[PDB]
Amino acid sequence: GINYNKLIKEFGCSKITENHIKRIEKLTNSKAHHFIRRGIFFSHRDLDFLLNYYEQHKCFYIYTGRGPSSLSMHLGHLIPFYFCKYLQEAFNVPLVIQLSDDEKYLFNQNYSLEYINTLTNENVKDIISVGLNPELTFIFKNTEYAGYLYPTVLSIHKKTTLNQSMNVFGFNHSDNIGKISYPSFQIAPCFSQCFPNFLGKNIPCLVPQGIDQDPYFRLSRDIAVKMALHKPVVVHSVFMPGLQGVNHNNSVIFLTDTPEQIKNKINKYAFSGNLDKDISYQYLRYLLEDDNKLNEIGEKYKKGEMLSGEIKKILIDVLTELVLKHQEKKKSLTDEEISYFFDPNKPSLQKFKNM
Amino acid sequence: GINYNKLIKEFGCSKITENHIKRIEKLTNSKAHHFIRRGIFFSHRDLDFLLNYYEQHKCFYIYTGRGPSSLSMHLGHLIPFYFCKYLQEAFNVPLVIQLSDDEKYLFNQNYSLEYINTLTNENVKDIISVGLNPELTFIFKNTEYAGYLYPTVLSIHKKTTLNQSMNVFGFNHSDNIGKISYPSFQIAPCFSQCFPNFLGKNIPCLVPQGIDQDPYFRLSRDIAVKMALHKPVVVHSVFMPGLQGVNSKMDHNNSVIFLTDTPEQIKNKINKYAFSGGGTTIQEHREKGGNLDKDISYQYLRYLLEDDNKLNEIGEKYKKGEMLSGEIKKILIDVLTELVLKHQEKKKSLTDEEISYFFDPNKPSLQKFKNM
Numbered sequence: 001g002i003n004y005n006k007l008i009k010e011f012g013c014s015k016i017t018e019n020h021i022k023r024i025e026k027l028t029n030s031k032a033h034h035f036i037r038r039g040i041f042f043s044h045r046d047l048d049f050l051l052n053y054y055e056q057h058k059c060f061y062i063y064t065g066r067g068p069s070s071l072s073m074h075l076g077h078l079i080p081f082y083f084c085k086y087l088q089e090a091f092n093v094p095l096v097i098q099l100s101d102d103e104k105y106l107f108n109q110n111y112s113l114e115y116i117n118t119l120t121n122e123n124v125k126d127i128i129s130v131g132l133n134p135e136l137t138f139i140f141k142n143t144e145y146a147g148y149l150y151p152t153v154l155s156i157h158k159k160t161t162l163n164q165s166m167n168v169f170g171f172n173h174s175d176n177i178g179k180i181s182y183p184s185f186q187i188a189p190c191f192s193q194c195f196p197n198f199l200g201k202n203i204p205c206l207v208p209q210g211i212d213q214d215p216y217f218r219l220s221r222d223i224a225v226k227m228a229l230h231k232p233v234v235v236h237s238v239f240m241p242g243l244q245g246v247n248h249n250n251s252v253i254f255l256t257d258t259p260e261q262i263k264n265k266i267n268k269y270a271f272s273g274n275l276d277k278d279i280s281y282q283y284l285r286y287l288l289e290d291d292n293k294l295n296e297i298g299e300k301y302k303k304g305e306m307l308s309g310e311i312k313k314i315l316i317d318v319l320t321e322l323v324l325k326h327q328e329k330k331k332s333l334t335d336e337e338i339s340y341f342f343d344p345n346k347p348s349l350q351k352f353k354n355m
Numbered sequence: 356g357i358n359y360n361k362l363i364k365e366f367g368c369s370k371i372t373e374n375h376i377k378r379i380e381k382l383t384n385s386k387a388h389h390f391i392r393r394g395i396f397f398s399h400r401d402l403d404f405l406l407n408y409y410e411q412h413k414c415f416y417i418y419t420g421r422g423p424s425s426l427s428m429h430l431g432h433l434i435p436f437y438f439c440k441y442l443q444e445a446f447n448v449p450l451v452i453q454l455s456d457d458e459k460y461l462f463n464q465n466y467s468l469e470y471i472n473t474l475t476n477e478n479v480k481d482i483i484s485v486g487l488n489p490e491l492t493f494i495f496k497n498t499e500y501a502g503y504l505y506p507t508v509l510s511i512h513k514k515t516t517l518n519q520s521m522n523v524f525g526f527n528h529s530d531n532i533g534k535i536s537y538p539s540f541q542i543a544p545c546f547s548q549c550f551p552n553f554l555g556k557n558i559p560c561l562v563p564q565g566i567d568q569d570p571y572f573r574l575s576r577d578i579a580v581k582m583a584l585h586k587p588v589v590v591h592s593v594f595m596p597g598l599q600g601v602n603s604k605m606d607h608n609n610s611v612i613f614l615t616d617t618p619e620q621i622k623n624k625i626n627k628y629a630f631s632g633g634g635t636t637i638q639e640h641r642e643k644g645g646n647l648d649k650d651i652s653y654q655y656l657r658y659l660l661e662d663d664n665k666l667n668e669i670g671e672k673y674k675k676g677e678m679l680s681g682e683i684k685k686i687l688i689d690v691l692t693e694l695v696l697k698h699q700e701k702k703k704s705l706t707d708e709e710i711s712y713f714f715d716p717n718k719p720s721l722q723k724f725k726n727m
Contacts, residue, residue, distance in 0.1 A: 183532075
């Protein structure tokens with residue numbers, strides 16, 4: 001298969017151990033998220049530094065981001081946001097969310113800034129609708145917030161050769177100079193000096209991402225050393241597989257999909273097992289919070305006591321509930337609720353300003 | 356020396372004609388600046404587009420800029436600012452001034468932002484001290500104003516391949532990506548959409564430049580076409596020569612007049628180091644007369660002496676041999692000394708409040724152009 005332990009050894013990452021989990025549960029006074037307990041988020045760099053930092057200072061922040069997509073977001077895009085929701089609540093720390101509308105403009109030849117803004121505003125609604133805590137969240141668009149990032153971006157630029165940018169990101173000489181210099185803007189928010197309205201300088205940053213992003217993220221950590229700032233901490237997730245195989249539109253669950261569209265996609269296109277190869281069981285590892293129910297389902301399926309139609313039906317109900325709750329939350333959002341996410345001066349955020 | 360008409364034909368610029376000058380005097384209800392009348396600013400691209408636009412709408416703006424220098428500014432650095440002072444007053448339009456502190460940080464490996472800010476603040480004081488009108492001036496640091504430039508910068512970036520940037524500016528693969536992408540930030544202020552606090556969209560921009568900068572400025576005009584925005588208008592100046600030779604441009608502190616120089620330092624530099632177009636003996640000078648094209652003092656008086664009659668009278672007497680080198684050098688020293696002392700006095704009097712006002716984009720006097 002994928003062999004993630006081989007990939008850890010290759011990249012030089014570290015496994016998240018049982019003791020890391022115990023330590024998280026202890027520091028947050030709460031059970032660890034199922035993504036961590038089930039090995040969905042499975043590796044890290046410098047997690048001990050972060051846990052020890054939080055233990056002594058009760059302080060860090062979480063950085064994540066989103067390039068605005070041309071199509072509707074699908075379930076795979078929300079996975080990291082569900083994890084950030086958990087992190088912000090369990091640790092009680094700020095979450096900053098970059099919308100890289102500039103990146104989308106620079107990388108898509110026929111897209112205008114105006115059109116990209118319509119996509120950005122829709123994505124923001126989906127992001128908020130996972131149930132993020134408004135009081136501990138700061139969302140920003142790069143087009144609007146660049147002035148706060150720029151002094152940091154300059155320092156990152158100065159320490160990144162063209163060779164390094166091209167080698168790391170696979171750019172070529174026909175690529176526009178926006179693409180070439182964009183990565184600094186994605187690195188910058190790892191450094192708390194980019195958020196002077198509510199963070200102190202040089203506060204550690206936790207950045208959840210896919211294991212596949214580690215080679216790119218190494219540039220952030222190398223740059224931090226040259227800037228004499230903390231290296232951003234990373235926890236890595238496995239690839240969430242498409243419906244058709246664990247290794248087009250019928251390969252994902254869009255958040256705008258109806259109950260009937262979800263039913264058909266799972267029944268017709270989701271691969272059936274063998275727990276390791278059954279896509280429905282795999283998705284239940286992400287979506288089912290109750291450990292006992294998951295193990296009971298896994299027990300019955302492997303023994304043959306549960307058929308494929310039944311495990312697919314359980315997934316469809318779970319998915320349908322999730323998607324309908326999401327659609328319901330999104331529909332209820334007011335412009336005032338949305339704007340509040342973009343406010344850097346919230347008193348709950350400003351608590352961390354002198355920590 | 357430098358054949359400027361040949362250089363016009365080579366670059367594809369246009370001469371500023373006597374009729375352009377008449378048209379400027381008519382539109383401003385005032386005599387044209389001596390730099391224009393004496394051919395110091397001598398060529399242009401799209402000046403008629405600008406004059407026609409002003410005639411109908413009474414509106415454009417002026418863009419200039421300054422990379423913060425490691426040393427004190429000298430007289431040559433102020434020349435374009437004296438011209439922008441005239442333009443803003445005669446036309447009654449805004450002047451925006453870019454301080455490219457970001458550029459200096461990106462291109463000088465051992466300079467910090469903090470150190471560059473010290474240089475920037477001192478340069479700003481020298482710029483203001485030419486007598487710029489606070490009400491029609493907007494100064495900005497790129498480090499502070501980048502957020503307003505960024506959407507425009509993105510569009511410029513998107514229209515510029517890495518190949519094009521590297522070929523045009525001579526970058527290599529060891530250059531940092533800040534250098535590679537910086538030129539867009541220098542182009543951006545040619546487009547009025549960068550100043551939404553006080554300018555309408557797609558308002559024409561006038562950019563005074565040395566003739567030597569035209570090849571680089573063509574990139575701004577080409578980008579404007581791809582953005583479907585007005586091309587920035589340019590008026591070009593001749594090279595201002597250093598003290599030692601008309602063919603050579605600005606130990607080597609004796610080739611320029613620093614703005615921190617004392618009256619005595621100026622006296623000595625002119626007397627000892629300024630090139631004379633006069634005869635080597637008094638008798639030789641009386642018989643053969645002085646050479647105006649090569650006398651540095653006469654050339655500098657072309658920049659500094661506002662009264663035409665006095666300049667022509669001085670030029671008449673020197674060329675005939677009726678005025679000696681010592682006398683024309685003395686006239687220049689008095690003129691320079693007065694200029695530099697006024698400057699030093701103005702700079703010393705500047706308050707933090709006066710300086711801050713230059714950086715305010717919401718001045719009611721600037722905002723009058725917002726719907727024009």
